[PDB]
Assembly symmetry: C3
Homo-oligomer: 143 residues x 3
Amino acid sequence: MVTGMFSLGRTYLFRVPEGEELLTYIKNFCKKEGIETAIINGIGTLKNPKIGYFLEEKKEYKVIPLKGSYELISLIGNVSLKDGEPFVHAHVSLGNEEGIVFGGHLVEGEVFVAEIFLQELKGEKIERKPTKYGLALWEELKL
Amino acid sequence: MVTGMFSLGRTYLFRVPEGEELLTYIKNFCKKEGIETAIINGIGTLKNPKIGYFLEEKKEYKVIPLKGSYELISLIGNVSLKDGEPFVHAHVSLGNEEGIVFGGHLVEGEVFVAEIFLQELKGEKIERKPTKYGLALWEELKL
Amino acid sequence: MVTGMFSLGRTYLFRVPEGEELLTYIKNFCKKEGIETAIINGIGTLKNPKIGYFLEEKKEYKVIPLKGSYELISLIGNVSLKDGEPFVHAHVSLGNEEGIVFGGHLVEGEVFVAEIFLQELKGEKIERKPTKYGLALWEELKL
């Protein structure tokens, strides 16, 4: 049965090297550390970030490729098992040179500076599996 | 005296079922679990979200009703006692189909997908009470 | 060697008094508590916030001074040692009266209401030092 309750595992705060692709780095970090489930938050600046808006009727993301440096105002997301490997899902809000904000699901983004907080969670299974929506999701917590 | 310092209670990470109203679900979750104080963060997609901008002179929120699916880029907020019951206060940033971001206080929002992190805090009282501003707030932490 | 791994120290949730400058208050809070490293998140409303977009070629921030009340939709950031003192680095997303969002690095902001979560981290050194970019950054975590 899903309870949604976990214990607090390992805790991290780090700067991602310039030039990494953020999602890739966080995945590789978790592989190295043996992290399966976590929550993430962070800030910094990304270059040429690609964001996504899900199109429910098409069962895929509309990908919007931005150009140049954007302030990474928020990154919020999670790490969870998908097809046997840690999988990173995050959304971002990005600031342009006039302070206007774009955002959505993070598809990819090259790091200029990224200061990430990562909190591992330990407990029951919480795995992304295919759904009718065309999204890979966890089993819901039904009250 | 207010110290603002708490111990870490129970920790949760879950997907909220499609069709729940997000604030309502988080409140009902906390009622079930006996959670009084917590911090929340999450992502996903909401449908027809209503956001609020507080009008200080009127002592009420201006409510802006959005339509359709918006990417839930950030949800950040907290749970605390108000009038004897757990009460959910959160702000959201929402992405539209072109990747432009709207946001404010979350008034209500129907969940398509919502992946929420919730960290219970244990300690001294931290209760929302009426103020001259027309906002229900905690006693401040004066340095 | 950088590991990026820390233990969870003291945990806090508080309302910042009306009229404080947010970054200043969080710094002074950490000085009082003897906090050197932490992660922060919060919401509320700021008045006349100033945001920044970094100009890499100029090695400085372009400062955009906003006016009036903005909903503080997200504050995400961290506290770390810089030149011997706790130093606060945060990014914000701010909502205007029509629900449009501005944001970037937080340069300064007067608090109307600010509900901040702060989690101290204990462990290895994590200090902001000058870099060729003109940003004060931690030593990166190279996988």
